[PDB]
Amino acid sequence: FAKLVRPPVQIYGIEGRYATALYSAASKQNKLEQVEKELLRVAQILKEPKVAASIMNPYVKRSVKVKSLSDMTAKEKFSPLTSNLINLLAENGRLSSTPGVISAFSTMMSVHRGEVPCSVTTASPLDEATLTELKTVLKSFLSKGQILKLEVKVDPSIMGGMIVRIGEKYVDMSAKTKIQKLSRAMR
Amino acid sequence: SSILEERILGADTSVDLEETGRVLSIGDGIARVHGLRNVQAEEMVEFSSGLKGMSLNLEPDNVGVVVFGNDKLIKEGDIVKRTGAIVDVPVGEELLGRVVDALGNAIDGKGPIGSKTRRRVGLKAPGIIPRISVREPMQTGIKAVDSLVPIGRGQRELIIGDRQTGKTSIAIDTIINQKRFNDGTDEKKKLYCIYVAIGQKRSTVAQLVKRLTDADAMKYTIVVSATASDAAPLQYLAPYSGCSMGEYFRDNGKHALIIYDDLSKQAVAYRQMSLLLRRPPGREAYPGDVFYLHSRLLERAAKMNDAFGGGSLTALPVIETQAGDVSAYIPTNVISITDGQIFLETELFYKGIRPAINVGLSVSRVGSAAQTRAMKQVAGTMKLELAQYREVAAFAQFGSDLDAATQQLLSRGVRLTELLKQGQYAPMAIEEQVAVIYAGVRGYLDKLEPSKITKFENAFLSHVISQHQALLGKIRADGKISEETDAKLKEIVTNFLAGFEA
Amino acid sequence: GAATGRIVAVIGAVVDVQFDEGLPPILNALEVQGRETRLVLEVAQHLGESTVRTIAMDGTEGLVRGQKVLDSGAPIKIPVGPETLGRIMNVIGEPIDERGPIKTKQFAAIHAEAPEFMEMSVEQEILVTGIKVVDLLAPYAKGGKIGLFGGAGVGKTVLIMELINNVAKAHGGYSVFAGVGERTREGNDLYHEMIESGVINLKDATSKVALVYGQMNEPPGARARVALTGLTVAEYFRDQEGQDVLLFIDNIFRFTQAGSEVSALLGRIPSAVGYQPTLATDMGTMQERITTTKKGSITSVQAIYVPADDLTDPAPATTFAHLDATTVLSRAIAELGIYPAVDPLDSTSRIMDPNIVGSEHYDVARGVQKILQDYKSLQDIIAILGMDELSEEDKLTVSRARKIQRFLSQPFQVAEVFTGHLGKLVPLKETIKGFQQILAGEYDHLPEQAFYMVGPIEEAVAKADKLA
Amino acid sequence: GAATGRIVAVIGAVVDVQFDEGLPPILNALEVQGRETRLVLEVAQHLGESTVRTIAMDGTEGLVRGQKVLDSGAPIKIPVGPETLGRIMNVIGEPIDERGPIKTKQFAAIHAEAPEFMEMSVEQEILVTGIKVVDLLAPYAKGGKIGLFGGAGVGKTVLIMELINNVAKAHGGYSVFAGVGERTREGNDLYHEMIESGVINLKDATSKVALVYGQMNEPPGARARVALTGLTVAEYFRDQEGQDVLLFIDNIFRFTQAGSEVSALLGRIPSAVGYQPTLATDMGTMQERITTTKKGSITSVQAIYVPADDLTDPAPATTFAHLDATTVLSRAIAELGIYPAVDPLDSTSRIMDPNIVGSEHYDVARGVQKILQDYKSLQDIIAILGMDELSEEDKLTVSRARKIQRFLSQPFQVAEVFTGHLGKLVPLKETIKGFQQILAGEYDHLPEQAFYMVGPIEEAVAKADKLAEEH
Amino acid sequence: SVQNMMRQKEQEHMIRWVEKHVVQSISAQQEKETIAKCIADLKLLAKKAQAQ
Ligand SMILES: Nc1ncnc2c1ncn2[C@@H]1O[C@H](COP(=O)(O)OP(=O)(O)OP(=O)(O)O)[C@@H](O)[C@H]1O
Ligand SMILES: Nc1ncnc2c1ncn2[C@@H]1O[C@H](COP(=O)(O)OP(=O)(O)O)[C@@H](O)[C@H]1O
Ligand SMILES: Nc1ncnc2c1ncn2[C@@H]1O[C@H](COP(=O)(O)OP(=O)(O)O)[C@@H](O)[C@H]1O
Ligand SMILES: [Mg+2]
Ligand SMILES: [Mg+2]
Ligand SMILES: [Mg+2]
């Protein structure tokens, strides 16, 4: 056997077996930034009431789901190493988990330049003068030549603060600090 | 009130970045946590609500975590934090006279314990160089223990038997009986004690603190308590925490004692806690390393050499067995870790021998025979006179008559058997033991009746403490029973026997 | 409407349910919409990515996938108060006496914690019952747990119908009965025997006993939780009213037998002979709330079943650490005819003590076990060889310990309808006096058929007077 | 360093590592970085995608995933040679006695193969230890293999520390004591019982023993490889130097039993009563390296714990074939005060043979065992008929048999702190002569209490005169 | 024994009065929360500065 390029996520399960065999095969010949553009076009033709009618049908035939997608994957735009991959999943019986692999390849390819975004969870939204700081003072932490991304979700049970999660960091400043006043009642 | 306001100004609201793992499941105590990259094994992790837990399994996808508490405040999607410390409990002499839970928080309500030093529950037993042999005695005050099956200081002795035979009472007369040394003057005859309650309901442990506080026994012990209501990772952690307060004493000079009541309930808290972590079962669904569970515990009970401090740490593990069968799985794995045993039975308890000790089977590696010098004289001959009895005294159906030949020897046993019986929560001393044992082996009781020897004992014992106090002080001071001390006792038994029954 | 969920999988009584936002915390209640009756699901697990696994209280037949499920917000709550007396309930607290609703001012959740260390009461006394085997050898207390271990067909409930007939009449406070997994005609003859005898009053508010019932027809998510229901009506009468309540439980084994029937389907590797991995933590969370405390006093009497007549089985043999008294019954005793078939050698107490039970009583206690053990320790030789190869002293612990076994059998009040013999109650002081006259040897001429099924000791010489 | 792997899964004492470049073979050693103590992991399986499954030799606390792992290129390499005498050593070959390091010039990797069929010395001898049950009924052999069975508390640490006194001081060759998982208390006596007795000398270079100690406070992967650090020091003295060695191991059941503690965590289906499915294979891989070839000799004495006195257990009953001589201690005999507890009707040797020990030694020890099996058929009659119903010939049997049973007992020298008696050491020519006369009838006129705890038969008449004078 | 029990019943009520009253007092404020956010920025601005 041979050694392979290490993906910077290393997920597990039935996704990350096939979603690393694709990352290692396409990182050879430097086919990396191209192949995500082709995997997002099979990511639209999978959801079709004739294509998805037999991509998850058990009772069609073991063989005719191999010729029907191989004729489909080659003619319209592309003939890269993905045409072998769709032929590889279909030859094994893993056609049901096909949307799982591309959602697994996307999170594996995103970290090659991405951030795994933070999650500010405070209140009803804010103005521009207090948000463009937190979209810039959250860039002062990382410092590795990167372009940050973010999510926002509103929760009122946190009464008077904001929680944020840069990766797996969780600097919590909120109204948990009422429960921390148990030490007054704790002798 | 000034107390609540001063507690709230001393509170520190420090904030820092944690290291944090989202929860993926929570059921029956196990919380498989996504995230938690740099976590150690056996690290203490802290949930959001105030709970606490210990990450046992490491795995590439998830991280198995068991909870010290209750799993109903924890919902999928929670936050698990990082402390940064393998699991440790407070330690010191400042815990003396308290009842504490399995992580060192007081459940008596006398307040916060002021403790300064913290010691792990997973530390290592000392090896071959820093020990020494067993020089000293440990007095229990039982008369069947101190004479026939003695226990040195630093020796693991196993009290084994059924339910409701005397296993807890044997190890609580021992707690009471060291009252006389602890108010004395020398710092090398004391014995500080520790009781670990595993799998016991709170209407037994709050009742044993009563029995230990009228006799003022609680001023020199600690009670580490993990009741049957606790989480199954809290009954597993309790003897490893109680043994680590014992090694404040032993690693600083003094002498400790520790009772595990019991160790058949620290095993079914390991069988359950490590089946829900998906570990494959062994025999009786016990894990692979129940022998490694008990062995890494019972080897800290050392006896250090005198260039380290010379301190000792006795241990008295209790084991409950089913139907009196000693060939089970967890009994035999712990018979072969301890130096000697005390086999408590049921047919001894009911025929009348209480404390129900099988003195035939209660073997003991004698601990360099540190019985004491005077007891060696009277219980050396007692050991052989009782052994001579047991070979020949099991007929219950007589046909022939040999009063010159056999019936003299078996009359010496029933006078020494009915001498060995005792009461409850009233333990003797050693020179009050030498006196009453002197009168049994020297033929000074063969003209009584055996239904009057228990009555003969207390009238004898009250006469010697009252009228003969300077006699017994020459046995305790000089150690031995001297030949002139043999002379003075020869009249006292016969003067009392002249006017005992009148 | 905090959350909406659809059934996803159904295996027996373990319904799976997926939510979309607002996951319920563990041991909430969920309401299944679209049924004729009430169907309440109680959350047990959290299986990952917005999906819970629940255990259902009633039957699950007729459920389809996608069927909606609504979130209550709270655990199973029941109406508790002084109007609960004389009413029968089920696991979710609905009146099954067909006499209309139960209207109280407050509601009590099924799941609550245990009392602390510093809320325990240590004071012990003696509750004299009127049974010779229990008064002499193993005395009950006033505020402590009691167990009645026994097989199938020995007498664990005829014995519990006496400790109502002797203690719940002369009681001053209230009373609570619970039926966990035993048969339903016996739960009907406790309604038509407490209405006739004035304990249930159908017409006003002068009733003493409460009732709670989940029997052996329910699904096993109900038998696993009916015992926490009668345990909650017997805590309001302790903490908030401050009374002295009794509590009779029969049978408490089915809290555990019907907990290893839903533990296989939750995805758990089994422990020894087939039981759940958590056998002895759920028992120590139910039993740690049945306590006497500083605010009241509950005097528990629990009947316990031993499977296939085995006392080393893991379900009976972990109950023993939670008791104070113990009355191990036996089968081979009851083949002779000694009823109540109590094992005198296996039954204990914590108050049998010379300072508590009195130093005269304590010596008739330990002195009658000594003569009983010595009859057992010769049964090897008597069975093979014969009676006639014994000494003369050990033909006098054999003939005196067969007069003592027969003088422990008493006719009960509840058993008059079986055999037609008058139920006898003895006092305490006439049993100590009546055993010292068998130990000292005053009755050594009377036969052994005269000490059998009589009350106080003067009937033994009267039965001996009859046969001549 | 090569193949600096990384840790992924620490579940118990079974760590799995993942290698980027170079996969190491089975049975190697791996070095976990960044720890102040030395933790050694040995490779055991190859899983796929370049991950191996190892076993730690120490505590697995503080093992964070993603931690580097080096590789040495060989199995564990201990010190060996002549300078390892009077020392105590670890499983991975380190000092544990605080005397400094072991300065040797030769290392031996602990995984070797059993010597072939054409390197097998065939000769038998005899060996005299001094005990009247060993030398009469189950005699040893110079170069044989000797196993000491029996339960817990019957006398195996005494009978093995008495033979260290008897044989291993009057011997020209060397000895090794390997402690495979026993009480650390008992590993402090024998270190000090042999400093005052000259076998260990702490200032000069004339010691004659080497110690290997990994005890029962150790994780169960390190209690499976002190059985092999023993017979790697005890093989350099046989092969390389042409000497003669003695092998003392206590206890060898903890080698098997510590392989059942990591079987299912490795990934195997467990066999019968709970043991690993490789019982008689990992055992016989080790018990064939303890042999006498044609370059030297080894006389091996191993203590064998029988769990719960159950001899038909699979851990002892697969050890009865790797041994020449079995001495089986019972417990129903040591309850009668008889010491050594050795069962007369269950011990057995190979050289009990009328062509090696002679046709006078053989006729005696086949009449001692024949009168003791004649006893047990009478003990079932006594329990019903009583003693004074028997005939006058059968009364003569019970009296001699109780005289023989008491004469098999002998006061050891290491019972001078337990019983207070004085020790014996009986020669072989007196052992045969004494037992020959009790069967004849030349001591039918004595009490039985003369024979209890004596040496030669001439001391058993010097007691029957003192009993009659003090009468 | 009466002096101590009436202190214990008073102590728990005194705690819950301060605790249950602060829930509405922290909920009503709307101007100081904007003050509370800028210091929460400045704490995080201070927090990343000591790391790197
Ligand atoms: N020295 C004694 N003499 C007579 N009776 C005793 C003595 N010690 C204890 N007992 C009695 O024996 C009974 C059982 O004792 P104990 O509670 O210590 O047993 P146990 O086996 O520890 O109980 P458990 O099985 O619940 O742990 C108690 O009722 C006690 O009063
Ligand atoms: N005191 C008694 N006197 C006579 N017969 C009894 C007595 N107690 C029990 N029995 C007999 O034993 C049976 C016991 O069954 P019961 O007590 O109803 O339930 P369980 O099977 O739980 O013991 C009764 O039907 C009755 O025939
Ligand atoms: N000469 C002797 N013969 C038989 N037993 C003895 C003798 N001297 C002492 N003993 C006792 O027998 C016990 C045997 O235990 P030991 O041999 O040390 O461990 P093991 O459990 O490995 O057999 C010792 O505790 C000791 O007290
Ligand atoms: Mg106990
Ligand atoms: Mg019934
Ligand atoms: Mg040993």
PDB file of N, CA and C in Angstrom, chain D residues 144-184:
ATOM      1  N   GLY D 144      16.004 -30.817  36.375  1.00  0.00           N
ATOM      2  CA  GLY D 144      14.601 -31.043  36.113  1.00  0.00           C
ATOM      3  C   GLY D 144      13.788 -29.775  36.276  1.00  0.00           C
ATOM      4  N   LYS D 145      12.470 -29.954  36.271  1.00  0.00           N
ATOM      5  CA  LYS D 145      11.535 -28.854  36.477  1.00  0.00           C
ATOM      6  C   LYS D 145      10.540 -29.234  37.560  1.00  0.00           C
ATOM      7  N   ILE D 146      10.316 -28.312  38.502  1.00  0.00           N
ATOM      8  CA  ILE D 146       9.674 -28.587  39.786  1.00  0.00           C
ATOM      9  C   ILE D 146       8.587 -27.551  40.026  1.00  0.00           C
ATOM     10  N   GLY D 147       7.369 -28.006  40.285  1.00  0.00           N
ATOM     11  CA  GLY D 147       6.244 -27.114  40.529  1.00  0.00           C
ATOM     12  C   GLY D 147       5.571 -27.383  41.860  1.00  0.00           C
ATOM     13  N   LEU D 148       5.253 -26.303  42.578  1.00  0.00           N
ATOM     14  CA  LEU D 148       4.713 -26.331  43.942  1.00  0.00           C
ATOM     15  C   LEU D 148       3.264 -25.857  43.903  1.00  0.00           C
ATOM     16  N   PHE D 149       2.322 -26.779  43.993  1.00  0.00           N
ATOM     17  CA  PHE D 149       0.920 -26.439  43.816  1.00  0.00           C
ATOM     18  C   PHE D 149       0.288 -26.084  45.158  1.00  0.00           C
ATOM     19  N   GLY D 150      -1.031 -26.023  45.205  1.00  0.00           N
ATOM     20  CA  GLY D 150      -1.743 -25.814  46.447  1.00  0.00           C
ATOM     21  C   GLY D 150      -2.354 -24.426  46.531  1.00  0.00           C
ATOM     22  N   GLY D 151      -3.349 -24.303  47.408  1.00  0.00           N
ATOM     23  CA  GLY D 151      -4.189 -23.124  47.483  1.00  0.00           C
ATOM     24  C   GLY D 151      -3.561 -21.911  48.131  1.00  0.00           C
ATOM     25  N   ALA D 152      -4.334 -21.131  48.880  1.00  0.00           N
ATOM     26  CA  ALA D 152      -3.822 -19.924  49.519  1.00  0.00           C
ATOM     27  C   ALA D 152      -3.684 -20.153  51.014  1.00  0.00           C
ATOM     28  N   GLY D 153      -2.489 -19.904  51.545  1.00  0.00           N
ATOM     29  CA  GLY D 153      -2.230 -20.096  52.957  1.00  0.00           C
ATOM     30  C   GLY D 153      -1.851 -21.496  53.372  1.00  0.00           C
ATOM     31  N   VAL D 154      -1.295 -22.307  52.472  1.00  0.00           N
ATOM     32  CA  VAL D 154      -0.925 -23.681  52.797  1.00  0.00           C
ATOM     33  C   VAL D 154       0.571 -23.881  52.945  1.00  0.00           C
ATOM     34  N   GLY D 155       1.391 -22.895  52.628  1.00  0.00           N
ATOM     35  CA  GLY D 155       2.806 -23.096  52.859  1.00  0.00           C
ATOM     36  C   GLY D 155       3.725 -23.054  51.659  1.00  0.00           C
ATOM     37  N   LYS D 156       3.431 -22.223  50.661  1.00  0.00           N
ATOM     38  CA  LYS D 156       4.240 -22.177  49.456  1.00  0.00           C
ATOM     39  C   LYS D 156       5.336 -21.136  49.486  1.00  0.00           C
ATOM     40  N   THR D 157       5.204 -20.073  50.258  1.00  0.00           N
ATOM     41  CA  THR D 157       6.309 -19.131  50.371  1.00  0.00           C
ATOM     42  C   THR D 157       7.311 -19.592  51.422  1.00  0.00           C
ATOM     43  N   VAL D 158       6.906 -20.505  52.297  1.00  0.00           N
ATOM     44  CA  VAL D 158       7.807 -21.104  53.274  1.00  0.00           C
ATOM     45  C   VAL D 158       8.595 -22.254  52.668  1.00  0.00           C
ATOM     46  N   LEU D 159       7.913 -23.175  51.979  1.00  0.00           N
ATOM     47  CA  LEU D 159       8.579 -24.284  51.301  1.00  0.00           C
ATOM     48  C   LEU D 159       9.482 -23.820  50.169  1.00  0.00           C
ATOM     49  N   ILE D 160       9.264 -22.630  49.623  1.00  0.00           N
ATOM     50  CA  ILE D 160      10.163 -22.144  48.590  1.00  0.00           C
ATOM     51  C   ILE D 160      11.286 -21.296  49.170  1.00  0.00           C
ATOM     52  N   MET D 161      11.133 -20.784  50.393  1.00  0.00           N
ATOM     53  CA  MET D 161      12.217 -20.067  51.047  1.00  0.00           C
ATOM     54  C   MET D 161      13.049 -20.962  51.941  1.00  0.00           C
ATOM     55  N   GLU D 162      12.603 -22.188  52.159  1.00  0.00           N
ATOM     56  CA  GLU D 162      13.406 -23.182  52.843  1.00  0.00           C
ATOM     57  C   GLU D 162      14.346 -23.883  51.873  1.00  0.00           C
ATOM     58  N   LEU D 163      13.884 -24.150  50.650  1.00  0.00           N
ATOM     59  CA  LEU D 163      14.752 -24.704  49.620  1.00  0.00           C
ATOM     60  C   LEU D 163      15.789 -23.699  49.145  1.00  0.00           C
ATOM     61  N   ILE D 164      15.514 -22.400  49.263  1.00  0.00           N
ATOM     62  CA  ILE D 164      16.549 -21.400  49.021  1.00  0.00           C
ATOM     63  C   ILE D 164      17.635 -21.499  50.090  1.00  0.00           C
ATOM     64  N   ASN D 165      17.254 -21.855  51.315  1.00  0.00           N
ATOM     65  CA  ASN D 165      18.244 -22.051  52.368  1.00  0.00           C
ATOM     66  C   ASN D 165      19.018 -23.343  52.159  1.00  0.00           C
ATOM     67  N   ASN D 166      18.303 -24.440  51.895  1.00  0.00           N
ATOM     68  CA  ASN D 166      18.915 -25.762  51.801  1.00  0.00           C
ATOM     69  C   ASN D 166      19.850 -25.866  50.608  1.00  0.00           C
ATOM     70  N   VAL D 167      19.319 -25.667  49.407  1.00  0.00           N
ATOM     71  CA  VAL D 167      20.072 -25.929  48.190  1.00  0.00           C
ATOM     72  C   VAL D 167      20.896 -24.725  47.770  1.00  0.00           C
ATOM     73  N   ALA D 168      20.312 -23.534  47.755  1.00  0.00           N
ATOM     74  CA  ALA D 168      20.939 -22.387  47.106  1.00  0.00           C
ATOM     75  C   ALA D 168      21.975 -21.674  47.963  1.00  0.00           C
ATOM     76  N   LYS D 169      22.501 -22.314  49.001  1.00  0.00           N
ATOM     77  CA  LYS D 169      23.701 -21.861  49.692  1.00  0.00           C
ATOM     78  C   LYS D 169      24.849 -22.847  49.564  1.00  0.00           C
ATOM     79  N   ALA D 170      24.536 -24.143  49.509  1.00  0.00           N
ATOM     80  CA  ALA D 170      25.502 -25.215  49.304  1.00  0.00           C
ATOM     81  C   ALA D 170      25.690 -25.551  47.832  1.00  0.00           C
ATOM     82  N   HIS D 171      25.538 -24.566  46.954  1.00  0.00           N
ATOM     83  CA  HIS D 171      25.533 -24.751  45.514  1.00  0.00           C
ATOM     84  C   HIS D 171      26.656 -23.927  44.899  1.00  0.00           C
ATOM     85  N   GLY D 172      27.270 -24.467  43.853  1.00  0.00           N
ATOM     86  CA  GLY D 172      28.332 -23.753  43.176  1.00  0.00           C
ATOM     87  C   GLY D 172      27.828 -22.790  42.125  1.00  0.00           C
ATOM     88  N   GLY D 173      26.692 -23.113  41.519  1.00  0.00           N
ATOM     89  CA  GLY D 173      26.103 -22.285  40.491  1.00  0.00           C
ATOM     90  C   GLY D 173      25.182 -21.225  41.061  1.00  0.00           C
ATOM     91  N   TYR D 174      24.543 -20.497  40.156  1.00  0.00           N
ATOM     92  CA  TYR D 174      23.853 -19.274  40.519  1.00  0.00           C
ATOM     93  C   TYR D 174      22.346 -19.487  40.565  1.00  0.00           C
ATOM     94  N   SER D 175      21.646 -18.455  41.034  1.00  0.00           N
ATOM     95  CA  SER D 175      20.210 -18.524  41.244  1.00  0.00           C
ATOM     96  C   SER D 175      19.571 -17.195  40.885  1.00  0.00           C
ATOM     97  N   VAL D 176      18.299 -17.256  40.493  1.00  0.00           N
ATOM     98  CA  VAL D 176      17.513 -16.077  40.141  1.00  0.00           C
ATOM     99  C   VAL D 176      16.134 -16.228  40.767  1.00  0.00           C
ATOM    100  N   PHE D 177      15.679 -15.190  41.478  1.00  0.00           N
ATOM    101  CA  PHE D 177      14.320 -15.127  42.004  1.00  0.00           C
ATOM    102  C   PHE D 177      13.535 -14.073  41.235  1.00  0.00           C
ATOM    103  N   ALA D 178      12.506 -14.513  40.512  1.00  0.00           N
ATOM    104  CA  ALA D 178      11.631 -13.639  39.744  1.00  0.00           C
ATOM    105  C   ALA D 178      10.279 -13.566  40.433  1.00  0.00           C
ATOM    106  N   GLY D 179       9.911 -12.375  40.892  1.00  0.00           N
ATOM    107  CA  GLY D 179       8.646 -12.188  41.572  1.00  0.00           C
ATOM    108  C   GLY D 179       7.571 -11.669  40.647  1.00  0.00           C
ATOM    109  N   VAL D 180       6.695 -12.561  40.204  1.00  0.00           N
ATOM    110  CA  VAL D 180       5.659 -12.237  39.228  1.00  0.00           C
ATOM    111  C   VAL D 180       4.385 -11.980  40.026  1.00  0.00           C
ATOM    112  N   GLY D 181       4.201 -10.739  40.457  1.00  0.00           N
ATOM    113  CA  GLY D 181       2.947 -10.351  41.070  1.00  0.00           C
ATOM    114  C   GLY D 181       2.592 -10.963  42.411  1.00  0.00           C
ATOM    115  N   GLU D 182       3.289 -10.600  43.487  1.00  0.00           N
ATOM    116  CA  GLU D 182       2.950 -11.089  44.822  1.00  0.00           C
ATOM    117  C   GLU D 182       3.050  -9.923  45.802  1.00  0.00           C
ATOM    118  N   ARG D 183       2.940 -10.209  47.099  1.00  0.00           N
ATOM    119  CA  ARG D 183       2.831  -9.154  48.100  1.00  0.00           C
ATOM    120  C   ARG D 183       4.158  -8.438  48.281  1.00  0.00           C
ATOM    121  N   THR D 184       4.130  -7.106  48.276  1.00  0.00           N
ATOM    122  CA  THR D 184       5.371  -6.343  48.370  1.00  0.00           C
ATOM    123  C   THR D 184       5.977  -6.431  49.771  1.00  0.00           C
TER     124      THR D 184
END
